[PDB]
Design a protein around this ligand. Structure first.
Ligand SMILES: COC(=O)C1CCN(C(=O)NC(C)(C)C)CC1
Length: 460
């Protein structure tokens, strides 16, 4: 029975509006409704993994698990296994997998982050799950961010708190936040970004939605505009939105958007918005393809419609050679040559690198680099040909060319990371000096760049 080199992943996000679901929710898991939808010919084909995020979820874990599992069994005739379930307040994540995957999944982690302070602490935040699927790390975050059209900056702050403080994945990757710990990271939820148009334009916006003319609305979507200005979700992807705004509907129909201010809304307008989103970030040159992104039309218990996204995702096998794991393979080496970091910092400490990768027995610390001044004000840290030669555990090119090296640049004075990035070993050639490059981030914001050349020796 061969190990897979691809899986499909279903991501669902639904703000349930504190109401129980209707009796049938199968359209959600079938990716049917509006937007980029799944072909009917695939309806019986189970996804490998289903990740369900809910917000304002009124159900117990048991109640929702029974609905989800019975839904999938009706669609696929497969009884899915529960990988993980985690709930913070009314924010929940469920991971289900096909039974054949039970002994491919390990290192399951869960965590939550509570956002805000005092007034603003008590219902918003995020839950997450991570695990290994054979040789591939997978992370999933369901966040319910701050509501209200005039709170985009608070949402951006909520995002940074969640990626700083959510403790998923390999804790040995200590310099790295969740945006670097996984081969594939999926971040979804009620992100609560709104279409920023004047209140007076409510009926005009409704008109546009009825005509399925989303361009002039999407150009005012706060998440797209904040991402384009690098204020949030730096280096994440989102599929093009081709479905109507998923909020705010009158319940029990989809014929009406309920946007006007009410005591129940704190006298706030809720212009039709794409509150409910799926984004992802995968390591460089790993296969990931969005095969659906849309909303259901027939689930109407909430003032939000459910959103679905599905993905092809490249995965690798749990590789054993005669040498590693448990020793190095002298036929393998990674050399970083003529490398330099460009940092935005004004500090003047010395810096060193750390190289982290599951292709190494443990992380590797470099010597300190040589600081110079860049022509436009910047710090340039030069490493020359001084960097330690990295000794992978396995030299086989079918393994090594699928690996990645995480890089942290750390202050000698404080041992704090000033920047993190990732280099793919999926090179055009081995035994050949080739350009490499990663942006460097810290707390998910851009802090610099790392560039240079690599020379990779494999057993071939
Ligand atoms: C399931 O993978 C494995 O366990 C093998 C795979 C290949 N291999 C060897 O060929 N070892 C010899 C040369 C000592 C015979 C290591 C172990």
């Amino acid at each position: 029975q061969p190990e897979p080199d691809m899986i499909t992943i279903f991501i669902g996000t639904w703000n349930m509006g504190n109401a129980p679901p209707p009796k049938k929710i199968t359209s959600w898991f079938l990716s049917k409704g509006q937007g980029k939808t799944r072909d009917d010919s695939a309806d019986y084909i189970p996804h490998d993994i289903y990740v369900i995020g809910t917000q304002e979820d009124p159900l117990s874990e048991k109640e929702w698990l029974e609905i989800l599992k019975h839904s999938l069994q009706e669609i696929t005739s497969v009884t899915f296994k529960t990988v993980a379930i985690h709930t913070l307040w009314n924010i929940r994540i469920v991971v289900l997998a096909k039974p054949e995957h039970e002994n491919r999944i390990s290192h399951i982690c869960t965590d939550n982050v509570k956002t805000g302070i005092a007034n603003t602490l008590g219902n918003k935040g995020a839950v997450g799950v991570s695990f290994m699927f054979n040789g591939t790390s997978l992370g999933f975050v369901n966040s319910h961010l701050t509501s209200g059209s005039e709170k985009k900056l608070r949402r951006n702050q909520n995002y940074m708190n969640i990626l700083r403080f959510l403790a998923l994945g390999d804790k040995k990757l200590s310099p790295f936040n969740i945006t670097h710990r996984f081969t594939h990271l999926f971040w979804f939820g009620d992100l609560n970004y709104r279409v920023d148009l004047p209140t007076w334009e409510a009926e005009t916006i409704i008109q546009k939605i009825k005509q399925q003319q989303y361009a002039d609305l999407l150009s005012h979507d706060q998440l797209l505009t904040e991402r384009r200005e690098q204020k949030v979700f730096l280096h994440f992807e989102e599929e093009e939105i081709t479905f109507a705004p998923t909020y705010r509907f009158e319940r029990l129909t989809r014929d009406k958007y309920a946007y006007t201010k009410q005591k129940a809304t704190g006298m706030k307008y809720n212009l039709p918005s794409w509150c409910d989103r799926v984004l992802w970030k995968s390591y460089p040159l790993v296969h990931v393809v969005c095969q659906s992104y849309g909303s259901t039309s027939d689930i109407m218990t909430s003032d939000h419609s459910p959103v679905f996204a599905t993905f092809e995702a490249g995965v690798t096998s749990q590789f054993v050679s005669k040498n590693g794991p448990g020793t190095v393979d002298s036929q393998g080496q990674i050399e970083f040559l003529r490398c330099y970091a460009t940092l935005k910092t004004k500090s003047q400490t010395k810096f060193y690198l750390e190289f982290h990768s599951s292709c190494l027995e443990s992380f590797v610390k470099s010597q300190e680099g040589e600081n110079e001044e860049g022509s436009e004000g910047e710090l340039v840290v030069k490493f020359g040909e001084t960097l330690p030669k990295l000794k992978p555990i396995i030299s086989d090119p079918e393994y090594l060319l699928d690996q990645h090296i995480l890089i942290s640049i750390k202050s000698s004075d404080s041992d704090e990371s000033y920047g993190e990035g990732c280099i793919a070993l999926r090179l055009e050639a081995t035994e050949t000096q080739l350009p490499i490059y990663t942006p460097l981030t810290h707390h998910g914001e851009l802090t610099g760049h790392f560039q240079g050349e690599i020379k990779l020796q494999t057993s071939q």
